[PDB]
């Protein structure tokens, strides 16, 4: 089996779409995401063409080996494909209708600088790769893109399922190559986060603030450092939830401050006691006393900040 | 092989039937399952017919490549399911009856909101796509939908494996595709949580009231502070029995509560000893004599008003 | 191929026979170990009989495709076996000698009540269904049922491996189904148990018994609180080797045991200190001075109940 | 199908190239990654020569099977690579112009000395074994060995796709090899490691040195070994990010050098204590004072030395 | 394809080898390595002997369908090695060169009893069940058994690879079968234990015998039970690198001595206090300065024991 020949010196057209049947896997650290869809293509070989008045049916059914088939392959994939051709369909005029249903991991880079406010677009890029005898572009069939109701990936919101109509044409390695962007937009579902993640973690901090209203150096000391440990142990506790990002982040910003004011909240709690041992209680008492407006004032000024970069 | 013809312009009903084998593998995380079960398929395609007197056998095997079968599969699987054709059987009158054993891994959401005390209605959704020449339907034997008595399910209790009877028809990518729902119902073995996961937890917050008692500074901060680090190490001790959900879940919440609980402890603590230390031990007194019976009752008043609203 | 005719309207019998090479990945939370065995079966199929005179062979090799052979399943496997037929022979008599070469995942519950002094036997079941033209029956050749001296299950003694030989014959989707119990007897290693997790416990539960030789409430709550910080830790470091069961375990058990004595321990030293405070140092000095014989007189007593209805 | 034949005694040369398309999971602790590119190997095989003009075309392209490939494998890969071939194009001369996609695991050694400022050279090793009709050599296409703009590793810098032009041959099990390295150059981004890593580590180490201007002998014990918990409790934390190595790695003893720091706080802390208990509080303060200047200018310098010593 | 007949009745030899080409994913619990090598075979069948002369060519390369080949299986795999055969010669006299490249996941049982300083010896164990019309017996060719010198066992040094060159023959199944071991010998990489295991664990212990220097129950029970918690935090820390073994280990037993020396800190603080406590401060003065030598002297000591009880 040849590809089918150009009438004057064009290239072949391939209508594809792609229908997610499934959605599953999403891998933060991996940036990978399971995918479970039917792949259609279309295209028309003059070759294939029928009178149906003669043969008495008004489409012919082919399998795979039978007719030339486009070698379309997914840019973003661990591996190849696993397809199951469901069905080929040619009408008299010679136009090919390709249907397989597909399951494959692919690759599409995530950015967690805005988690868990975060949104996402998935990419799944499809390829072709032109021949000698004739150069093939790739199409988008927008009736045939869609994804099931049904669809879900636990903690997203999936907003569409589109593609990038205009292909990416290109040469590589001395051949044509026409490569179609097809988009899945998610937006992460940042509820249970107030509960779960921000708020304990405000209310250990604010129990350091405590030492404000202290005077015992050995109570402070056991403020501060038990907390901290209790920070970390939360930390600990929540870390499957927080992502490995390799640049700095929204939440990892908030997570480096709230470490600096353990920091600052030991340096007050040890400046006020050698004040006090060193027996200038006046000043000791005025830091302690500002500190208890000071701390939260810069930690509800600096978070403004922050969120104010990040968004 | 081509699909039976219709004698007039009816569709093909394919009789299905799933009998389940085993069942292993839930992932609370993943919500997906692990099936092993019977498929069994039964159409008529009268071309398969034959006399059983002029043969003389009164039922006729065939190989799979042999006949047409309808391409059955399964909407909600990560990949197509590992099959094996047990049997193939035509009656006199052209009745197939195909049996194949399957495993597969199935996709179903999950609701963890009444975790522990949950139930859960797992899908298996069935599909066939209808051909050119003629629309296939799908239909269930309930004789034929059944599940093995030895099925199990670590930490759930099996109630029914049924079937929706009526198939849902509707339009795929210029086609007609028959979906049918098998349910598999199972409700949580909640017991071990109590003495396993709920009592260590009242116990390490009941010691943190023991500071209701106490006027030493020193040792009430230790006691709340310490047992906060206690109750978050615990945590981290069961956090693989609990469940990551995007959701707010009925024993999150009082894992919230609990935190918010530590919080207002700290407040009090603290509350009582600036009272003390600013020279006004009577009201000092006074808050922690009712908070010995404020924190008790509110607790038990807001555990009863959660437990209503989850059920 | 089509299943040997009958003489009269006896079934036919197959002699089966497992012969463990390698066992290994046991998994105690998904009930589930790995196999690596020889399957044997035997069957007596009087069209392949031959003279061995004019043959001048004794013996007769085929290739699975060339003769007829049942359709042998297992029935709690994850997936279908991995097999490579080793060998087929055929003698005179139409005496069928197959032989196989298996990898499978088993499904086979485990009872960690007893642990780390649990003893289990591992299922594999072997079934036929039977054929619309005779019925199948399986049964075991004693001679071809054994294990290799090398198998090793790490943490285990490996007991014995037998066949239970009258099978289970049963109707299943209107056709007879004979079932084959082998069995796989192994016995946990509770040796390092001891000084790895029993002994370092008892050590962290029994320093917080030194409280009670103390009458400063401060170094108490930091005995009785950091310790039980310590048995959570600890917990934690060894958690990977207990197992996570939806009932009540021996091991567990003893563990909701030591909790209930870290809240009685507190609850004692706070009523020392509420006395002492309230003064009345003549109870708070006897219900110490008690406890030091209570407390492990009542746990060895609660630990010989706990063992006597667990054993 | 057997090799071309030579027109001398010459050996056949396989021009070989490789073009990144996707580059991920690079497993730090099994120092692999997975690899998805084109492979293109050109050879001449005159048996498929032909004349346009008979043939009626330029180029003919081929099935795997019709001709004589080259059996090239790769010596560092877990499995053999997933290939599927793309193109089979001959000219009349008979050059062979071959191309696949193939996903491979590669194992390449990693050097983590310099962590997290570690730069990685990985190899891919291209390799054909000579047959007893003719010696087969490989050979670098160049125009042919590219990447893909878009290939990335998160948390690397993806510098250079390069390959080492001439082949090592060599003999092996009594024939010639010919072997090829294919060299992807890493650097990491050593950015979040700062306030993710080190910064939170460095704090909580300046909180211990706060011992040195307090005399609360039970202060100070609180101060240093509370803040040795914290440090480790913080290193549980990082753990997915510092890399588990056989050898001395630059963040590694960065580490070992904070624990002796800690040892070395904790004796001060043991001597003043003992000196001011021993009645001579004298040399107790001046340790101390000392201690202030001496632990931060040790730790400053130690650092350098360590700095220099690894870069 | 039949098996080459016998002179005699002697039984045909198979001359193998294993040459090591990659030697990755030492898994440490499952007790298994991933190895990618070469396998070579050798035998003499006379019915593919030819007359050099004759035929034209002195080397016939033959297709493995082509020619009986020998079923070599390896004992100790999980599933069957995934080969491809790289080539098949045969000489005038009919003695056949066979070749192929193999991967598979090796369980060989590992000794920890040694650790970090143990040395293991991995098997490959190959295998030949024999025939009815011959005896088939493996053999070892001693110049096709190597190992590629870029072999490498991240945290090994990889001493040698060799064979037992008498095969182990035995019944099974009623048939003949010859057994051959390929032995690995690999050491441990025990620096990086020292600054990472033994140091900081030593440097803990240590802490807590600084309360032999002092007098404060306090601080003493804060320096006893905060490092308790700081080596059981520690212990998680580095839980990765120590093995979960079900006997006793040279570490396993220096960890179980350290809690033991942990139990008797607590005893003697205890003592000391209640002795002081009691009105005898000379009694409990002259245990703390004992226990100042008594516990190094005791603990180096038992380490000794521990060493040569070990070594
Ligand atoms: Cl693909
Ligand atoms: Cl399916
Ligand atoms: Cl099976
Ligand atoms: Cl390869
Ligand atoms: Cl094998």
């Known amino acids: 089996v040849s590809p089918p020949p150009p009438i004057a010196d064009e290239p072949?057209?391939?209508?594809?779409?792609?229908?997610?049947?499934?959605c599953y896997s999403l891998d933060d650290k991996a940036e990978t995401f399971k995918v479970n869809a039917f792949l259609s293509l279309s295209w028309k070989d003059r070759r294939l063409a029928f009178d149906p008045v003669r043969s008495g049916v008004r489409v012919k059914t082919y399998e795979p080996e039978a007719i030339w088939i486009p070698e379309i392959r997914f840019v973003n994939v661990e591996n190849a494909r696993d397809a199951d051709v469901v069905d080929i369909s040619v009408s008299p005029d010679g136009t090919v209708q390709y249907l397989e249903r597909f399951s494959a991991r692919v690759l599409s880079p995530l950015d967690?600088?805005?988690?868990?406010?975060?949104?996402?677009?998935l990419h799944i890029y499809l390829i072709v790769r032109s021949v000698d005898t004739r150069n093939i572009v790739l199409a988008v069939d927008l009736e045939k893109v869609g994804k099931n109701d049904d669809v879900f990936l636990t903690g997203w919101d999936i907003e569409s399922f589109t593609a990038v109509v205009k292909p990416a044409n290109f040469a590589l390695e001395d051949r044509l190559e026409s490569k179609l962007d097809y988009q899945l937009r998610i937006s992460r579902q940042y509820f249970s986060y107030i509960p779960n993640i921000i708020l304990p973690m405000l209310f250990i901090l604010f129990i350091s603030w405590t030492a404000f209203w202290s005077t015992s150096y050995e109570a402070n000391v056991t403020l501060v450092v038990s907390t901290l440990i209790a920070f970390i142990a939360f930390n600990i506790l929540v870390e499957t939830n927080l992502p490995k990002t390799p640049y700095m982040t929204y939440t990892g910003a908030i997570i480096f401050m709230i470490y600096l004011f353990y920091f600052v909240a030991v340096i007050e709690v040890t400046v006020q006691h050698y004040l006090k041992v060193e027996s200038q209680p006046a000043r000791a008492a005025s830091i302690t006393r500002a500190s208890r407006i000071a701390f939260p004032v810069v930690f509800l000024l600096a978070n403004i900040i922050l969120a104010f970069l990040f968004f």
Chains 1, 2, 3, 4, 5 share one sequence.
């Open 112 to 121: 967690f600088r805005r988690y868990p406010f975060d949104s996402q677009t």
């Open 12 to 22: 072949l057209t391939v209508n594809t779409g792609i229908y997610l049947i499934e």
